[PDB]
Short mmCIF file of all heavy atoms in Angstrom, two decimals:
data_model
loop_
_atom_site.label_atom_id
_atom_site.label_comp_id
_atom_site.label_asym_id
_atom_site.label_seq_id
_atom_site.Cartn_x
_atom_site.Cartn_y
_atom_site.Cartn_z
N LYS A 565 19.68 10.52 6.38
CA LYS A 565 21.13 10.45 6.42
C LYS A 565 21.77 11.37 5.37
O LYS A 565 21.61 11.16 4.17
CB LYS A 565 21.60 9.01 6.19
N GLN A 566 22.50 12.38 5.83
CA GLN A 566 22.63 12.66 7.26
C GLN A 566 22.14 14.06 7.60
O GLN A 566 22.93 14.99 7.77
CB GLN A 566 24.09 12.50 7.70
N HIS A 567 20.82 14.20 7.70
CA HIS A 567 20.14 15.48 7.90
C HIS A 567 20.42 16.12 9.26
O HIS A 567 20.59 15.43 10.27
CB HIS A 567 18.64 15.28 7.74
CG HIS A 567 17.91 16.51 7.31
ND1 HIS A 567 17.40 16.66 6.03
CD2 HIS A 567 17.60 17.65 7.97
CE1 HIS A 567 16.81 17.84 5.93
NE2 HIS A 567 16.92 18.46 7.10
N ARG A 568 20.46 17.45 9.28
CA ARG A 568 20.65 18.21 10.51
C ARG A 568 19.29 18.63 11.09
O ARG A 568 18.56 19.41 10.47
CB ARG A 568 21.52 19.44 10.27
N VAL A 569 18.95 18.10 12.26
CA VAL A 569 17.64 18.33 12.87
C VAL A 569 17.73 18.87 14.30
O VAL A 569 18.50 18.36 15.12
CB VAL A 569 16.80 17.04 12.89
CG1 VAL A 569 15.41 17.30 13.45
CG2 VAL A 569 16.71 16.44 11.50
N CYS A 570 16.93 19.90 14.62
CA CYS A 570 16.86 20.40 15.99
C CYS A 570 15.53 20.07 16.68
O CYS A 570 14.48 20.00 16.04
CB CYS A 570 17.06 21.92 16.01
SG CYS A 570 18.77 22.46 16.19
N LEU A 571 15.60 19.86 17.99
CA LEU A 571 14.42 19.58 18.81
C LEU A 571 14.00 20.83 19.59
O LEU A 571 14.66 21.23 20.55
CB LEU A 571 14.70 18.42 19.76
CG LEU A 571 14.79 17.06 19.06
CD1 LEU A 571 15.25 15.98 20.02
CD2 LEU A 571 13.46 16.69 18.42
N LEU A 572 12.89 21.43 19.17
CA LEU A 572 12.38 22.65 19.79
C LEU A 572 11.23 22.35 20.76
O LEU A 572 10.15 21.94 20.34
CB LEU A 572 11.91 23.64 18.72
CG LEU A 572 12.94 24.55 18.05
CD1 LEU A 572 14.09 23.77 17.44
CD2 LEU A 572 12.27 25.42 17.00
N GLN A 573 11.47 22.56 22.05
CA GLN A 573 10.46 22.23 23.05
C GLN A 573 9.56 23.42 23.36
O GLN A 573 10.04 24.52 23.61
CB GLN A 573 11.13 21.71 24.33
CG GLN A 573 10.15 21.31 25.41
CD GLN A 573 9.28 20.14 25.00
OE1 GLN A 573 8.20 20.32 24.45
NE2 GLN A 573 9.77 18.93 25.26
N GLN A 574 8.26 23.17 23.36
CA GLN A 574 7.28 24.19 23.75
C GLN A 574 6.41 23.67 24.89
O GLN A 574 6.63 22.58 25.41
CB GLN A 574 6.41 24.58 22.55
CG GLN A 574 7.11 25.45 21.51
CD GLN A 574 8.12 24.69 20.68
OE1 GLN A 574 9.12 25.26 20.22
NE2 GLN A 574 7.88 23.40 20.47
N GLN A 575 5.42 24.47 25.28
CA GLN A 575 4.57 24.12 26.42
C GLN A 575 3.35 23.27 26.04
O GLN A 575 2.71 22.68 26.90
CB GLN A 575 4.14 25.39 27.15
CG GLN A 575 5.32 26.17 27.72
CD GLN A 575 4.93 27.51 28.30
OE1 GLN A 575 3.81 27.98 28.12
NE2 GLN A 575 5.87 28.14 29.01
N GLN A 576 3.04 23.21 24.74
CA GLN A 576 1.89 22.43 24.28
C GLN A 576 2.31 21.37 23.27
O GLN A 576 1.61 20.37 23.09
CB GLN A 576 0.83 23.34 23.66
CG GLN A 576 0.08 24.21 24.66
CD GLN A 576 -1.06 23.48 25.34
OE1 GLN A 576 -0.89 22.91 26.42
NE2 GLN A 576 -2.23 23.50 24.72
N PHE A 577 3.45 21.58 22.63
CA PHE A 577 3.92 20.66 21.59
C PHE A 577 5.44 20.57 21.51
O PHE A 577 6.15 21.45 21.99
CB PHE A 577 3.34 21.05 20.22
CG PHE A 577 3.88 22.34 19.68
CD1 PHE A 577 4.96 22.36 18.82
CD2 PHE A 577 3.30 23.55 20.03
CE1 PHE A 577 5.46 23.55 18.32
CE2 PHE A 577 3.79 24.75 19.54
CZ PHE A 577 4.87 24.74 18.68
N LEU A 578 5.92 19.50 20.90
CA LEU A 578 7.35 19.34 20.63
C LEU A 578 7.51 19.22 19.13
O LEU A 578 6.83 18.42 18.49
CB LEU A 578 7.91 18.10 21.33
CG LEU A 578 9.36 17.76 20.98
CD1 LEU A 578 10.30 18.86 21.45
CD2 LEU A 578 9.77 16.42 21.58
N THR A 579 8.40 20.03 18.56
CA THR A 579 8.57 20.05 17.11
C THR A 579 10.01 19.78 16.68
O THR A 579 10.96 20.32 17.24
CB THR A 579 8.09 21.39 16.51
OG1 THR A 579 8.43 21.44 15.12
CG2 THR A 579 8.72 22.57 17.24
N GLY A 580 10.17 18.90 15.69
CA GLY A 580 11.47 18.63 15.11
C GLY A 580 11.74 19.55 13.94
O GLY A 580 11.18 19.38 12.86
N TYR A 581 12.62 20.52 14.15
CA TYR A 581 12.90 21.54 13.15
C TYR A 581 14.14 21.19 12.32
O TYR A 581 15.12 20.67 12.85
CB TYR A 581 13.08 22.91 13.81
CG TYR A 581 12.90 24.07 12.85
CD1 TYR A 581 11.63 24.56 12.56
CD2 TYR A 581 13.99 24.66 12.24
CE1 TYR A 581 11.47 25.62 11.68
CE2 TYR A 581 13.83 25.72 11.36
CZ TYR A 581 12.57 26.19 11.09
OH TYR A 581 12.40 27.25 10.22
N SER A 582 14.07 21.47 11.02
CA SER A 582 15.19 21.19 10.13
C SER A 582 16.00 22.46 9.90
O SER A 582 15.45 23.50 9.55
CB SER A 582 14.69 20.64 8.79
OG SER A 582 15.74 20.53 7.85
N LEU A 583 17.31 22.36 10.09
CA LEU A 583 18.21 23.49 9.88
C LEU A 583 18.65 23.63 8.43
O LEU A 583 18.99 24.72 7.96
CB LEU A 583 19.44 23.37 10.78
CG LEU A 583 19.39 23.82 12.25
CD1 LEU A 583 18.00 23.69 12.85
CD2 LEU A 583 20.39 23.00 13.06
N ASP A 584 18.64 22.51 7.71
CA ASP A 584 19.06 22.50 6.31
C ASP A 584 17.94 22.99 5.40
O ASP A 584 18.21 23.50 4.31
CB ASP A 584 19.50 21.10 5.90
CG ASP A 584 20.80 20.69 6.55
OD1 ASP A 584 21.58 21.58 6.95
OD2 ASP A 584 21.06 19.47 6.66
N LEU A 585 16.70 22.86 5.84
CA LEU A 585 15.56 23.28 5.04
C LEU A 585 14.87 24.49 5.65
O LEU A 585 14.04 25.12 5.00
CB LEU A 585 14.56 22.14 4.86
CG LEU A 585 14.74 21.18 3.69
CD1 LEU A 585 16.06 20.43 3.77
CD2 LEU A 585 13.58 20.20 3.63
N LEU A 586 15.21 24.78 6.90
CA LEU A 586 14.60 25.89 7.65
C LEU A 586 13.08 25.83 7.72
O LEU A 586 12.40 26.81 7.40
CB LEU A 586 15.07 27.23 7.09
CG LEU A 586 16.54 27.51 7.41
CD1 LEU A 586 16.90 28.96 7.15
CD2 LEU A 586 16.85 27.13 8.86
#
Side-chain angles (χ1 to χ4, degrees), residues 567 569-586:
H567 207 107
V569 184
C570 270
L571 289 172
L572 277 54
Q573 181 64 269
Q574 286 73 210
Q575 298 173 349
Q576 289 277 93
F577 68 94
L578 173 64
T579 173
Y581 200 84
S582 172
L583 278 29
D584 290 337
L585 271 62
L586 289 193

